[PDB]
Protein backbone atom coordinates (compact mmCIF):
# COMPACT_ATOMS: atom_id res chain seq x y z
CA UNK A 1 0.00 0.00 0.00
CA UNK A 2 1.15 3.52 -0.74
CA UNK A 3 0.71 6.15 1.95
CA UNK A 4 1.08 9.33 -0.02
CA UNK A 5 0.69 13.02 0.80
CA UNK A 6 -0.45 16.08 -1.13
CA UNK A 7 1.84 18.94 -2.08
CA UNK A 8 0.96 19.65 -5.73
CA UNK A 9 -2.18 17.59 -6.11
CA UNK A 10 -3.96 15.38 -3.58
CA UNK A 11 -3.48 12.49 -6.00
CA UNK A 12 -0.05 12.73 -4.47
CA UNK A 13 -2.07 11.63 -1.41
CA UNK A 14 -1.97 8.04 -2.59
CA UNK A 15 -2.95 4.79 -1.02
CA UNK A 16 -2.47 2.05 -3.61
CA UNK A 17 -0.79 -0.91 -5.09
CA UNK A 18 -1.82 1.09 -8.20
CA UNK A 19 0.27 3.76 -9.86
CA UNK A 20 -0.57 7.27 -11.04
CA UNK A 21 0.90 10.61 -12.06
CA UNK A 22 2.01 13.75 -10.28
CA UNK A 23 2.73 16.96 -12.17
CA UNK A 24 5.00 19.69 -10.82
CA UNK A 25 5.77 17.92 -7.55
CA UNK A 26 8.60 15.58 -6.63
CA UNK A 27 9.67 14.99 -3.10
CA UNK A 28 9.11 18.54 -2.24
CA UNK A 29 5.41 18.70 -3.20
CA UNK A 30 4.62 15.04 -3.03
CA UNK A 31 4.34 12.55 -0.21
CA UNK A 32 5.03 8.82 -0.17
CA UNK A 33 5.32 6.26 2.64
CA UNK A 34 4.60 2.54 2.91
CA UNK A 35 1.04 2.35 4.23
CA UNK A 36 -0.46 -1.10 3.73
CA UNK A 37 -2.15 -3.99 5.56
CA UNK A 38 -1.93 -7.78 5.94
CA UNK A 39 -0.08 -7.37 9.24
CA UNK A 40 -1.21 -7.00 12.79
CA UNK A 41 2.06 -5.52 14.05
CA UNK A 42 2.03 -6.40 17.75
CA UNK A 43 4.79 -4.62 19.58
CA UNK A 44 6.39 -1.96 17.42
CA UNK A 45 8.49 0.30 19.66
CA UNK A 46 11.24 2.66 18.41
CA UNK A 47 9.51 3.14 15.04
CA UNK A 48 6.09 4.68 15.72
CA UNK A 49 3.05 3.86 13.62
Amino acid at each position, epitope marked *: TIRYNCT*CGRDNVGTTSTDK*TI*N*T*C*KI*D*QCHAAVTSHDKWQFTSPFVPR
Partner: antibody
Amino acid sequence: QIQLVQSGREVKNPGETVKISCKASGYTFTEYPMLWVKQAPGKGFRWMGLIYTNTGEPTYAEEFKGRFVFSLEISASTAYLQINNLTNEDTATYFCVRDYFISLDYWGQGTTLTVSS
Amino acid sequence: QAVVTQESALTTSPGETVTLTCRSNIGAVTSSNCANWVQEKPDHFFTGLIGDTNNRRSGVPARFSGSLIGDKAALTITGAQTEDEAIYFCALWYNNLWVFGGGTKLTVLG
Protein backbone atom coordinates in the same frame (compact mmCIF):
# COMPACT_ATOMS: atom_id res chain seq x y z
CA GLN B 1 7.60 22.62 -20.44
CA ILE B 2 10.98 24.15 -19.51
CA GLN B 3 12.80 26.67 -21.67
CA LEU B 4 15.98 27.83 -19.93
CA VAL B 5 15.82 31.58 -20.55
CA GLN B 6 19.47 32.09 -19.64
CA SER B 7 22.63 33.90 -20.60
CA GLY B 8 25.23 33.10 -23.20
CA ARG B 9 28.98 32.68 -23.34
CA GLU B 10 30.26 34.19 -20.11
CA VAL B 11 33.99 34.49 -19.47
CA LYS B 12 36.08 34.07 -16.34
CA ASN B 13 39.55 34.13 -14.78
CA PRO B 14 41.81 31.16 -13.98
CA GLY B 15 40.31 29.81 -10.76
CA GLU B 16 37.77 32.65 -10.40
CA THR B 17 33.98 32.32 -10.30
CA VAL B 18 30.97 33.53 -12.28
CA LYS B 19 27.26 32.64 -12.34
CA ILE B 20 25.50 31.90 -15.63
CA SER B 21 21.74 32.07 -15.08
CA CYS B 22 18.84 30.07 -16.45
CA LYS B 23 15.43 31.32 -15.33
CA ALA B 24 12.78 28.81 -16.39
CA SER B 25 10.25 30.24 -18.83
CA GLY B 26 7.57 28.31 -20.66
CA TYR B 27 6.96 25.68 -17.95
CA THR B 28 6.60 25.28 -14.20
CA PHE B 29 10.07 24.95 -12.71
CA THR B 30 8.57 26.06 -9.39
CA GLU B 31 7.61 22.40 -9.08
CA TYR B 32 10.07 21.25 -11.78
CA PRO B 33 13.44 19.64 -10.98
CA MET B 34 15.09 20.62 -14.23
CA LEU B 35 18.59 20.13 -15.59
CA TRP B 36 21.08 22.97 -15.33
CA VAL B 37 24.06 21.04 -16.62
CA LYS B 38 27.44 21.70 -18.22
CA GLN B 39 28.55 20.91 -21.76
CA ALA B 40 31.65 18.88 -22.63
CA PRO B 41 31.94 20.39 -26.13
CA GLY B 42 33.13 17.34 -28.06
CA LYS B 43 30.34 14.99 -26.96
CA GLY B 44 27.51 17.43 -26.31
CA PHE B 45 25.76 17.84 -22.97
CA ARG B 46 27.29 17.56 -19.49
CA TRP B 47 25.61 16.03 -16.45
CA MET B 48 26.08 18.90 -14.00
CA GLY B 49 22.91 18.58 -11.96
CA LEU B 50 19.22 19.28 -11.82
CA ILE B 51 17.40 21.92 -9.77
CA TYR B 52 14.51 20.79 -7.56
CA THR B 53 11.25 22.62 -8.04
CA ASN B 54 9.96 23.71 -4.63
CA THR B 55 13.11 24.29 -2.55
CA GLY B 56 15.40 25.63 -5.33
CA GLU B 57 18.55 23.65 -4.51
CA PRO B 58 20.19 21.45 -7.15
CA THR B 59 21.53 17.98 -7.15
CA TYR B 60 25.01 18.22 -8.62
CA ALA B 61 26.60 15.96 -11.21
CA GLU B 62 29.66 13.84 -10.44
CA GLU B 63 31.78 15.54 -13.08
CA PHE B 64 29.92 18.74 -12.09
CA LYS B 65 31.24 18.42 -8.53
CA GLY B 66 33.73 21.12 -9.25
CA ARG B 67 32.73 23.90 -11.66
CA PHE B 68 28.91 24.09 -11.74
CA VAL B 69 27.05 25.16 -8.59
CA PHE B 70 23.33 25.53 -7.85
CA SER B 71 21.19 28.61 -7.23
CA LEU B 72 17.48 29.21 -7.61
CA GLU B 73 16.12 32.30 -9.38
CA ILE B 74 12.70 30.87 -8.62
CA SER B 75 10.58 33.89 -9.60
CA ALA B 76 9.51 31.81 -12.61
CA SER B 77 10.88 28.61 -11.13
CA THR B 78 14.43 29.06 -12.45
CA ALA B 79 18.04 28.81 -11.29
CA TYR B 80 21.64 29.71 -12.06
CA LEU B 81 24.78 27.65 -12.50
CA GLN B 82 27.58 29.08 -10.38
CA ILE B 83 31.16 28.62 -11.59
CA ASN B 84 33.97 28.03 -9.10
CA ASN B 85 37.49 26.84 -9.92
CA LEU B 86 37.50 28.51 -13.35
CA THR B 87 39.54 26.08 -15.34
CA ASN B 88 42.10 25.80 -18.06
CA GLU B 89 39.93 22.98 -19.45
CA ASP B 90 36.61 24.50 -18.41
CA THR B 91 35.92 26.21 -21.76
CA ALA B 92 32.68 24.58 -22.93
CA THR B 93 28.89 24.76 -23.35
CA TYR B 94 26.04 24.79 -20.83
CA PHE B 95 22.34 23.98 -20.93
CA CYS B 96 19.00 23.96 -19.09
CA VAL B 97 15.90 21.77 -19.40
CA ARG B 98 12.61 21.09 -17.60
CA ASP B 99 9.85 18.49 -18.02
CA TYR B 100 8.15 15.46 -16.39
CA PHE B 101 8.60 11.69 -16.94
CA ILE B 102 11.93 11.47 -15.18
CA SER B 103 13.96 12.46 -18.20
CA LEU B 104 13.96 16.25 -18.69
CA ASP B 105 11.16 16.85 -21.15
CA TYR B 106 12.37 20.10 -22.73
CA TRP B 107 15.95 21.26 -23.34
CA GLY B 108 16.51 24.99 -22.97
CA GLN B 109 19.43 27.16 -23.91
CA GLY B 110 22.30 27.66 -21.51
CA THR B 111 25.44 29.36 -22.83
CA THR B 112 29.15 28.79 -23.48
CA LEU B 113 31.98 29.28 -20.98
CA THR B 114 35.26 31.03 -21.84
CA VAL B 115 37.52 30.35 -18.86
CA SER B 116 40.65 32.00 -20.24
CA SER B 117 42.72 35.19 -20.31
CA GLN C 1 28.88 3.33 -15.40
CA ALA C 2 26.83 2.63 -18.53
CA VAL C 3 27.16 3.20 -22.28
CA VAL C 4 24.76 3.59 -25.18
CA THR C 5 26.34 0.75 -27.16
CA GLN C 6 24.56 1.47 -30.41
CA GLU C 7 24.26 3.99 -33.15
CA SER C 8 26.10 7.10 -32.12
CA ALA C 9 24.99 7.98 -35.65
CA LEU C 10 21.67 7.30 -37.36
CA THR C 11 20.72 6.53 -40.95
CA THR C 12 17.63 8.45 -42.05
CA SER C 13 16.73 9.11 -45.67
CA PRO C 14 14.01 10.50 -47.97
CA GLY C 15 10.99 8.25 -47.97
CA GLU C 16 11.92 7.03 -44.47
CA THR C 17 13.62 7.86 -41.16
CA VAL C 18 16.44 6.29 -39.13
CA THR C 19 15.69 4.49 -35.88
CA LEU C 20 18.93 4.15 -33.93
CA THR C 21 18.85 0.88 -32.04
CA CYS C 22 21.11 2.24 -29.32
CA ARG C 23 21.85 -1.22 -27.89
CA SER C 24 22.30 -1.86 -24.18
CA ASN C 25 25.65 -1.10 -22.70
CA ILE C 26 23.62 -0.40 -19.56
CA GLY C 27 21.28 -3.40 -19.69
CA ALA C 28 18.02 -4.06 -21.40
CA VAL C 29 16.07 -1.13 -22.81
CA THR C 30 13.32 0.40 -20.69
CA SER C 31 11.19 3.45 -20.08
CA SER C 32 12.39 3.47 -16.47
CA ASN C 33 15.94 4.09 -17.65
CA CYS C 34 14.18 6.62 -19.91
CA ALA C 35 16.11 5.81 -23.07
CA ASN C 36 15.14 8.72 -25.27
CA TRP C 37 16.00 10.47 -28.52
CA VAL C 38 16.47 14.19 -27.91
CA GLN C 39 16.80 15.68 -31.38
CA GLU C 40 19.12 18.58 -32.22
CA LYS C 41 20.45 20.64 -35.13
CA PRO C 42 22.95 23.42 -35.83
CA ASP C 43 22.39 25.82 -32.97
CA HIS C 44 23.35 22.78 -30.91
CA PHE C 45 20.29 22.45 -28.65
CA PHE C 46 18.92 18.97 -27.88
CA THR C 47 15.12 18.93 -27.97
CA GLY C 48 12.58 16.28 -27.09
CA LEU C 49 10.53 14.31 -29.60
CA ILE C 50 10.47 10.85 -27.97
CA GLY C 51 11.29 10.29 -24.32
CA ASP C 52 10.55 8.29 -21.18
CA THR C 53 10.25 5.13 -23.31
CA ASN C 54 6.64 5.72 -24.34
CA ASN C 55 6.16 9.49 -24.61
CA ARG C 56 6.13 11.68 -27.69
CA ARG C 57 7.41 15.25 -27.78
CA SER C 58 5.59 18.54 -28.20
CA GLY C 59 6.07 20.46 -31.41
CA VAL C 60 7.07 17.15 -33.01
CA PRO C 61 5.49 15.90 -36.25
CA ALA C 62 5.21 12.20 -37.07
CA ARG C 63 9.03 12.07 -37.50
CA PHE C 64 9.84 10.42 -34.14
CA SER C 65 9.43 7.38 -31.86
CA GLY C 66 10.80 6.93 -28.34
CA SER C 67 11.19 3.60 -26.57
CA LEU C 68 13.60 0.76 -25.98
CA ILE C 69 14.44 -0.70 -29.41
CA GLY C 70 16.48 -3.72 -30.46
CA ASP C 71 18.23 -4.50 -27.19
CA LYS C 72 18.74 -0.96 -25.83
CA ALA C 73 17.19 2.47 -25.94
CA ALA C 74 15.42 2.97 -29.28
CA LEU C 75 15.41 6.46 -30.76
CA THR C 76 13.52 6.87 -34.03
CA ILE C 77 14.00 9.91 -36.16
CA THR C 78 11.36 8.06 -38.16
CA GLY C 79 9.74 10.32 -40.70
CA ALA C 80 12.91 12.04 -41.79
CA GLN C 81 12.41 14.89 -44.23
CA THR C 82 14.05 18.29 -44.47
CA GLU C 83 12.22 18.90 -41.16
CA ASP C 84 12.47 15.33 -39.87
CA GLU C 85 16.18 14.61 -39.26
CA ALA C 86 18.38 15.65 -36.33
CA ILE C 87 21.32 14.65 -34.12
CA TYR C 88 19.76 13.17 -30.98
CA PHE C 89 21.26 12.79 -27.53
CA CYS C 90 20.68 9.37 -25.99
CA ALA C 91 18.30 9.85 -23.11
CA LEU C 92 19.32 7.95 -20.01
CA TRP C 93 17.46 8.72 -16.80
CA TYR C 94 17.14 5.70 -14.49
CA ASN C 95 14.83 7.54 -12.10
CA ASN C 96 17.28 10.44 -11.87
CA LEU C 97 17.25 12.64 -14.96
CA TRP C 98 17.64 12.25 -18.72
CA VAL C 99 21.26 13.00 -19.53
CA PHE C 100 23.19 12.19 -22.71
CA GLY C 101 24.32 8.74 -23.72
CA GLY C 102 25.49 7.97 -27.25
CA GLY C 103 22.71 9.59 -29.28
CA THR C 104 21.86 8.78 -32.86
CA LYS C 105 22.27 11.29 -35.68
CA LEU C 106 19.26 10.36 -37.82
CA THR C 107 19.21 11.82 -41.34
CA VAL C 108 16.38 12.97 -43.63
CA LEU C 109 15.96 13.64 -47.33
CA GLY C 110 16.51 17.24 -48.33
